[PDB]
Amino acid sequence: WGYGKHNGPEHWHKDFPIAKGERQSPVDIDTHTAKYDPSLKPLSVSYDQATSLRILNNGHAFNVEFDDSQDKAVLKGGPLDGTYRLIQFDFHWGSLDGQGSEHTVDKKKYAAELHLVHWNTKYGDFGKAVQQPDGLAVLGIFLKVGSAKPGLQKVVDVLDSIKTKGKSADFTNFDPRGLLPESLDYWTYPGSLTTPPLLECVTWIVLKEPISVSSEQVLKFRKLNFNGEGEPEELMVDNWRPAQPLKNRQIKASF
Numbered sequence: 179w180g181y182g183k184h185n186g187p188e189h190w191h192k193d194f195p196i197a198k199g200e201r202q203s204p205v206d207i208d209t210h211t212a213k214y215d216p217s218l219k220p221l222s223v224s225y226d227q228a229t230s231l232r233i234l235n236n237g238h239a240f241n242v243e244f245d246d247s248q249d250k251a252v253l254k255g256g257p258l259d260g261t262y263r264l265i266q267f268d269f270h271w272g273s274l275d276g277q278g279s280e281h282t283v284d285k286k287k288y289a290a291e292l293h294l295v296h297w298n299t300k301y302g303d304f305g306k307a308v309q310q311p312d313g314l315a316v317l318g319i320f321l322k323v324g325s326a327k328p329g330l331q332k333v334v335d336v337l338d339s340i341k342t343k344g345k346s347a348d349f350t351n352f353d354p355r356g357l358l359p360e361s362l363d364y365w366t367y368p369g370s371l372t373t374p375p376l377l378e379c380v381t382w383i384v385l386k387e388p389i390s391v392s393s394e395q396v397l398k399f400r401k402l403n404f405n406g407e408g409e410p411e412e413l414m415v416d417n418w419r420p421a422q423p424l425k426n427r428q429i430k431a432s433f
């Protein structure tokens with residue numbers, strides 16, 4: 179599976195039938211339709227004690243992994259019950275600035291989309307959590323092109339080291355707090371992973387307020403390769419999945 183003409187999103191349902199399931203992601207967030215729910219609590223992001231280990235090019239994107247053996251980087255509050263631990267953060271981007279985000283707002287597509295993945299500690303490991311309906315929590319942050327994101331630069335400079343599929347690099351002392359917007363106002367709804375196996379185990383929390391990145395930051399993302407080293411070069415662009423039918427589900431807003 180991939181993002182090309184022959185193995186793209188429109189073909190995933192042949193290997194992964196859940197692809198056409200009842201609670202697929204991403205979705206188009208309709209702001210006039212999203213319901214303001216007063217019973218939603220503020221988000222609780224505790225990331226001061228986070229411990230990054232590495233960055234890798236898994237052939238469909240780049241992931242920064244964290245030590246999730248203890249409650250070091252955690253998410254709680256919001257629509258969530260219990261503590262969810264930070265395991266990884268990844269991005270989805272386009273060939274152009276006009277596309278890249280997975281989630282959309284009023285049909286508006288952003289330059290890229292950052293996902294912070296967390297798993298419910300009640301289930302013991304990441305692999306058990308993806309077998310559950312309340313198994314994961316993904317924080318979605320929209321990136322727009324304007325000014326540079328200081329906090330983003332350490333990631334930017336290491337992409338050269340992981341250009342191709344299978345590459346990884348030591349990535350310690352990275353502080354995720356540098357990627358967060360000023361506001362934690364959000365939208366929430368029940369969905370799934372945006373890549374195979376599209377397990378319908380996620381509680382989405384999409385931040386209203388996007389982060390701005392400079393043109394040159396996003397440019398380095400586009401220099402990544404889908405392919406493995408020693409193979410024809412396929413730029414890693416448009417690694418995003420198109421909006422899926424809402425189908426009954428309701429999107430709640432914390433504002």
Ligand SMILES: [Zn+2]
Binds near residue numbers: 269270293
């Ligand atoms: Zn993602």
